[PDB]
A paper describes a structure:
In the present study, we functionally characterized the hyperthermophilic M38 β-aspartyl peptidase FiBAP, a protein repair enzyme involved in hydrolysis of isoAsp residue-containing peptides in F. islandicum AW-1. The overall structure of each monomer can be divided into two distinct domains; an N-terminal β-sandwich domain (M1–G56; G344–E386) and a C-terminal catalytic domain (L57–K343), that are mainly involved in dimerization and catalysis, respectively. The catalytic domain at the C-terminus of the molecule folds into a (β/α)8 triosephosphate isomerase (TIM)-barrel motif.
Crystal structures of the ligand-free form of FiBAP and the ligand-bound form bound with N-carbobenzoxy-β-Asp-Leu (Cbz-β-DL) as a substrate analog were determined at resolutions of 2.6 and 2.7 Å, respectively. Cbz-β-DL-free and -bound structures belonged to I422 and P2212 space groups, with one and four subunits in the asymmetric unit, respectively. The ligand-free model included most amino acids except for residues D254–R259 and P290–L302, corresponding to the flexible loops in the molecule. Zn1 is coordinated by E156, H195, and H224 residues, while Zn2 is bound by H61, H63, E156, and D285. In the metal coordination network, Zn1 interacts with Zn2 via E156. In addition, E156 in FiBAP forms a cis-peptide bond with G155 in the loop between α4 and β10, which is conserved in the corresponding loop of CpIadA between G165 and E166. The cis-peptide bond favors loop bending in FiBAP, which positions E156 toward the metal, as opposed to the carbamylated lysine (KCX162) in EcIadA, suggesting that FiBAP belongs to the Type-I IadAs. Similar to EcIadA and CpIadA, size-exclusion chromatography indicated that FiBAP is an octamer in solution, usually referred to as a “tetramer of dimers”, as supported by symmetry-related molecule analysis. The initial dimer is formed when the β-sandwich domain of each monomer interacts with an adjacent monomer, mainly through hydrophobic interactions involving several residues (I2, I4, V34, V35, V38, L39, F41, and I46) in the loop between β4 and β5. Additionally, the substrate-binding cavity of the catalytic domain participates in dimerization by providing the second point of contact between adjacent partners through salt bridges. These four salt bridges are formed by E107 (α2), K114 (α2), R143 (α3), and D149 (α3) of each monomer of the dimer.
Numbering used by the authors:
A (entry chain X), B (entry chain X), C (entry chain X), D (entry chain X): 1 to 253, 260 to 289, 303 to 386
The structure:
């Protein structure tokens, strides 16, 4: 069914004011309200007066199958619920494994990514986990990314962390070169996602790769880059050379935060190089609710919405080479509708289907 | 802490009337109320007047990690919640895999069994899954049962079913001989659990094993044996030769049922050879609530409670060689307290800890 | 871009006469010509007056990477050209390997299927090849169909043929059970495609599977079933029990033919159980042109077009569980436009893109 | 059966003087003698007047399956007898392999650990042996510690020794990181036990791990650290940074000894960082009798018993995260009874069972 959203202020994410959006699975037309609209086929209309229309948020780091286990088997966290995603405005998720690559399987990660997609979400996964050498579906990360549609990279590889497998630079280079080449063969981005711990070495290895080899900076995507001011300023040096860094969203649950980090990146013209992620179901427990929460905390510091949205729409889309994050002709019909007063998510659209309409969740399988 | 339950009618499961139970992790003493009780150490007392004290129920067939997936990735079911167990009177669970041995891992089954145990449940697992040759932790089912404490058998191996891997008698015999010998080395029972489908061959192979080889009938534990009157009467022939059969509990959610099956087994003196199981989280969805529900439906047909309890206490304990299912000195302190009028579970004790006291659930990690 | 085809007689494949079709990637609306059509967005119109609009043809058996090699390395055939497909009306192809599973790789089959899809074709592949035990991407055919989107089955497994690996019934049953279960987990059909040679045993094993096991007849898809009258009459017995059989299309390049076979199946009410395939690039050389050629030869025997089209639209779609073969709302916009006089293919549409418009091929990469 | 020890002076190991101990498998109550004791259940009383009650000794390094073989097949030593343990006051043993990882199997180490436990001992094992890369049950040390209850670490890895496999720092770091992460997932300590030879490098690598990585010092447990004054003073530098070191007990069978080592550690406030071990059945032959012998030699130098006991109770318990080494409520009922005059072991209790009562050994299987 073709649908039309009328009377919303649209952030594309660039503010283009009051515009009407016609979509199937892809956006057909953005423009001024028709006012004849005599249409020769069945079609749905949604009155979004009072609402902002945004691109659906992209969370590029979620433990969709559950994580935890750093404190024993009793610290394993539950799997992601799609209902959590819908009421937090997240329409696209990138799932990985974490510390535990033994009791959490890649095949379960894939299966979970496929069931989230069935219920109307958009999903991609990494192969590997914290440990080097990385777990694989097929015996090599290069075969994983060539043969399995949803695999977009390897991650999250731990460096400068007490849970790392203490990988060498040589081991890292082989993994980065394999996912880069596998990316080229398969027409995918080929991302290495680095879990960066609090170790003094920080992102040394990332600088070593770009200085000592021909490997472009765009495959290297460190996260937890707001863990400390010192790490975040190593991050801005990495951005200045063309890199993108990921900051762990503020959880709804205190000196230097992701909020400070985002404000510094803006003042220095590097907000194009910054993503945020929930680390949802991570070790208590990441919520995907952290993404819209974190955007709302940055707005309250005076930053314009067209600019803040980059961290959860334009920037993750560029990193993963997705046709998402943009309301525009031929882009995929993934949108959230926010109340212009309260800024509460009231409607959520993915592939042009309402997952949520005016606070009313669609029908789900175990909810 | 040493505890005492006073003023309950005790089913051990044999009815021994009004008796007092003193326990730590194991039962210290069953007998008449002290009426001096001047005890030289800290100690808890529970007034169970109005309540029946039962042995904790043993569900020998639960998909603790989730199952389903027969209808695509959207039909994968969620993992078991310990809270479901507690309020359904199940203190012991035996976890297996089902149709899906690809996206459901053995290591996850183990990890889940370990976290249920941390929260106060008693857990055992099978190695393998539906498919022959069976998935293993270590490359052989015999090494699995010798090296991994919780592995008590292989299961559930599908026979006479459209989801089976069409196993031969020779393949079955090798698997049964391996789990029997692995059982002997490890001092465990060595159970083969057969998923029996609706195929015309039924439990042919089980009769073939005992008639044509030296393999004792006690390792062979078919389930879904109330699927049809014809299969259940093959089951009673199997019981008459010394076998135990498992019947899928009636789900709280219509000619020949598990209720009819249990009543026939009683009238023919074969209730000692019968277990029930929820198939909890199985493909809608098995609930562990099915076990106490099914016991309550048999009571309403006039069968005595001391006799019905055998299917969820004495019989599963004998099959798996567990020190459970009996309220008696040196047995493990696993009990339920039922209201003598309503027959509602009001308290649940495992290893002598209250998981539930007077409808009040203990503190759990993601609940 | 939204497009509309005006003034064609539409075969859906049921004849619904002069109707107008509005589509993006999926069909939006079939119905009577608008005659106001004032549409508030960019949109393309195609005047198909003089043309029949058909569903795009589905060829379920093509050696897309090349085949041959039965007569030495000089008998290897070239890979499929997408241009061959377009000018033969084939919009969907199912690619497999044949006799040679050594020098022809599965990963090449996948890569070729992906490049045909990029140029605008719709592609699926089998895992395996002629030989039992079958070649795999990941070490098991069950993992292949669960993990790799395009894998829809195993094939083509040779039986009753001098190039077979002389597989046993037990080996066949394990392979059929694995692809059936892998199908259920992955939400795909799980087809076993049998290459049937001229050996006296014919499709004995197929009857053995359905008579002796619980395995439904719909997974079993023999081809070359018009090789002889005797084999084809074994085929009609298989159809009468619910099976679908595949007949090798007549090549444009003499007693009992595929034409006779199709006419017999119609007179006996079994045309619903019949597909044809080119065996394109097969050992001279199969052409995908055989499909439309074979449909044209059946029309010249007086059979109605709505009925003949079933063999290349409805029937392959049902076998592979595809949303193809039907012009109807929500179905994928794959169509051919035929001249009503000459019956020459003049336009070809896949995912709503013109691969060919009025004899003019789109822009291709090495053509 | 509940039991009570009356009239002993209790070292917990802190001296708490004349106290009474009530226990099942765990200690129920420590306190002043009841003097009413009218107890409503069967119960055993032991008159320990004239005896000191100590926590059962923990020997964290025993070749329970036999060792030796450095001088050819004729130098293989016999397996440990449980009777040796009982009459030497050792109630807990940690078993490993040594030089020979070829003819001594891990599965035998496990089996031996299980049979010692059956006869009433408490047992844990390491995976691996001297050689890097280390032998495993399952193909990785991380899977070994997650899947096998008794595996508490990897050991004993040889460094600075002529029998080492000359491991690199990188190989060591991977092994330490794997056992640390496997420890976290499994809720176990994750110990690397280093056999330190007489090579000039000593424990260089241990300092390299803590200085150059985020890996905490508590996983690193070198032994033979009294082999020389020079090595022992490297050991005290390691203790000063938070490490625990192991000293080979003096064998009952001459400048710088374990006695000197323990006295130096006390004078410098580092006795909390010191364990001793028999190296029992090691290459003549370690005896587990060395542990109580070595404690008796330190007492004869004037050190107080509450302090000396730390090396065989509190310190090994902290290293391995065991609920042992403490006489206290909820701790496991493992105790020795010593004659206050002669200091001879006269009774030994494990899990609250008498292995030895007044010089009378319990009934054993091949003794
Ligand atoms: Zn992380
Ligand atoms: Zn993470
Ligand atoms: Zn079943
Ligand atoms: Zn089941
Ligand atoms: Zn063929
Ligand atoms: Zn072929
Ligand atoms: Zn040593
Ligand atoms: Zn040693």
């Amino acid at each position: 069914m073709i649908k039309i959203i009328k009377n919303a202020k649209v952030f594309s994410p660039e503010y283009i004011g009051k515009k009407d959006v016609i979509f199937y699975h892809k956006v057909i037309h953005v423009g001024e309200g028709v006012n004849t609209s005599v249409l020769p086929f069945e079609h749905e209309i949604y009155d979004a007066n009072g609402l902002l229309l945004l691109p659906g948020l992209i969370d590029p780091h979620v433990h969709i199958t559950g994580g935890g286990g750093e404190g024993g088997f009793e610290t394993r966290t539950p799997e992601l619920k799609i209902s959590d995603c819908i009421r937090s405005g997240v329409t696209t998720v990138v799932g990985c494994l974490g510390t535990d690559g033994i009791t959490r399987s890649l095949e379960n990660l894939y299966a979970k990514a496929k069931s989230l997609e069935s219920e109307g979400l958009n999903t991609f996964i990494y192969t590997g986990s914290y440990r080097v050498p990385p777990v694989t579906f097929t015996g090599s990360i290069m075969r994983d990314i060539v043969l399995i549609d949803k695999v977009i990279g390897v991650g999250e590889i731990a460096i400068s962390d007490h849970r790392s497998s203490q990988p060498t630079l040589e081991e890292i280079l082989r993994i980065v070169a394999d996912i880069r080449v596998g990316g080229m063969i398969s027409g995918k981005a080929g991302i290495v996602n680095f879990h960066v711990g609090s170790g003094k070495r920080g992102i040394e290895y990332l600088f070593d790769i770009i200085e000592k080899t021909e490997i472009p900076i765009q495959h290297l995507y460190p996260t937890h880059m707001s863990r400390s001011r010192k790490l975040f300023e190593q991050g801005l040096e990495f951005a200045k050379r063309g890199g993108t860094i990921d900051l762990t969203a503020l959880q709804p649950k205190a000196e230097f935060t992701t909020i400070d980090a985002i404000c510094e990146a803006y003042e220095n013209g590097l907000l194009d190089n910054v993503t945020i992620s929930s680390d949802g179901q991570g070790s208590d427990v990441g919520s995907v609710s952290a993404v819209w929460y974190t955007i709302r905390k940055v707005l309250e510091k005076g930053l314009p919405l067209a600019e803040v949205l980059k961290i959860s729409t334009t920037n993750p889309a560029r990193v993963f080479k997705l046709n998402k994050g943009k309301i525009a002709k031929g882009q995929d019909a993934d949108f959230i509708l926010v109340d212009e007063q309260s800024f509460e998510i009231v409607s959520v659209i993915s592939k042009g289907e309402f997952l949520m309409k005016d606070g009313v969740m669609k029908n789900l399988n175990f909810e």
